[PDB]
Symmetry: C2
Subunit: 278 residues, 2 copies
């Protein structure tokens, strides 16, 4: 559901399996996208500006802003991705009246509409009351710093908090497919462990840097970070370092990641953490 400041999928409530993305003269249109694929330009960074229920809706990948083309109130006006103008045609009232969510232009009062919905265009239109083509669902994909710190303290495997660099950050929660892809490209899996000179902390540091670089290379938007923790843990046998993430399906679930071999666990391989950072 929509929860204000955050990064989201915006999915049509009118047709299944369909969510919004930005296409790759005239500006690129906001278009429909199948949930069978996860291209980065389906991620929307929604940021509060001024008033209650008012937000900008920015494409995290392309950096451009959801914009009602030419400020037009006309039915069928294209919704496009445009450079930031501060204009009211880049501001959106996102509200529900019964758990049904609409996206309304602050400027025109027209609504983001799936028109004629692999078919369908995304346009502004006056209120429609005989179909649900103006209804949208929002899947949150981010956590705030406050959220993540609460999750760490509540996590049975940790029961403790870690310092964050940012004091009020917004974090994108990656999929395991994404984390794995970054890990496969890093070549850590083919880098042997060696005592002190390339040890567990080095794997976890290098991987944390690789996730930060991947976010930098892929997202033109700013104002959010990719969550990627570090933790140091021990047991009777000695010390170890891991990375850590939370799950999109349950943001209270911490998942530990072993950057030596690209594996995941819920329990950090029974290591008890004593230190960490994000």
């Amino acid at each position: 559901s929509f929860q204000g400041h955050g990064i989201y999928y915006i999915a049509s409530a009118y047709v299944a399996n369909t969510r919004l993305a930005l296409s790759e003269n005239k500006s690129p249109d906001v278009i429909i996208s199948s949930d069978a694929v996860d291209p980065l330009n389906n991620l929307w960074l929604i940021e509060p500006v001024g008033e209650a229920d008012t937000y900008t809706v920015r494409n995290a990948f392309a950096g451009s802003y959801m914009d009602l083309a030419g400020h037009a109130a006309t039915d069928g006006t294209a919704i496009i991705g445009y450079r930031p103008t501060g204009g009211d045609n880049q501001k959106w009232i996102i509200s529900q009246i019964n758990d049904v969510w609409k996206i309304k232009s602050k400027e025109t009062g027209t609504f983001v509409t799936l028109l004629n919905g692999g078919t369908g265009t995304v346009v502004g239109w006056q209120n429609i009351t005989n179909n649900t083509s103006q209804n949208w669902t929002f899947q949150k994909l981010s956590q705030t710093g406050a959220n993540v710190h609460a999750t760490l303290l509540a996590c049975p495997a940790l029961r403790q908090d870690f310092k964050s660099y940012l004091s009020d950050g917004l974090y994108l929660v990656l999929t395991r497919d994404q984390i794995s892809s970054i890990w496969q490209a890093s070549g850590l899996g083919s880098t042997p462990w060696r005592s002190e000179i390339f040890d567990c902390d080095d794997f976890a540091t290098v991987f944390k840097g690789a996730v930060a670089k991947w976010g930098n290379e892929n997202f033109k938007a700013n104002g959010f970070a990719l969550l990627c923790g570090l933790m140091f843990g021990s047991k009777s046998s000695g010390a170890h370092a891991y990375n850590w993430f939370v799950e999109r399906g349950n943001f209270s679930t911490v998942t530990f990641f072993e950057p030596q071999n690209g594996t995941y666990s819920a329990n950090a391989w029974d290591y008890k953490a004593y230190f960490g950072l994000f």
Copy 2:
């Protein structure tokens, strides 16, 4: 001077401005090299094994071991860099008689000798009493974790300790040329800062990973780490992240490094640290 377990230059006391290195059929010889050049193969990792004052002397770069070619005690026998064998021709007694240091093959009883004051070869030889060709000075280039923790607590800019991943590590202290060389190739100097998405912590984490990678690529020996700290600090204007090191010329001197632009500060740009690690 020699302080047991550590990384050293091994300089001749007989010919000024010279120290031992490895050469880049036969095995490579240990050769004399000018202190006007600083190839990584002049760095020797010296590790205690067995009896009082007895050590292996390993080339940190090549990973080979200082080896009296054949347990052969003929005068003039090559001192070479060889794979580890567990052999007593790879074990060295390092002791002083006048605060004059010598290097004696635990096995043949002969001494590492600079034969013939370009020129000059490094050989085993029986005791020499009419010249100083068997006398060496050891310049320490490493710190233990105990040393670095004591330095952090004593540093006026810090007056606090940071956690280390290793609990008893051995660290090589890099030169400014090496650091600036790793930084040049990190590409961080051409990476723009962006709010959250590639922020100060990302520069410091990526740089710390870059140092770890460069050490793994260049040092075939194990059993030591390259020192490279992270710190977070603040002043009224907000938070920042830096890397930190200690100086070769005064190991008590902490130096702060700005991985956004490759500069150094003795005082961390008056940011007051509240968090750090190495």
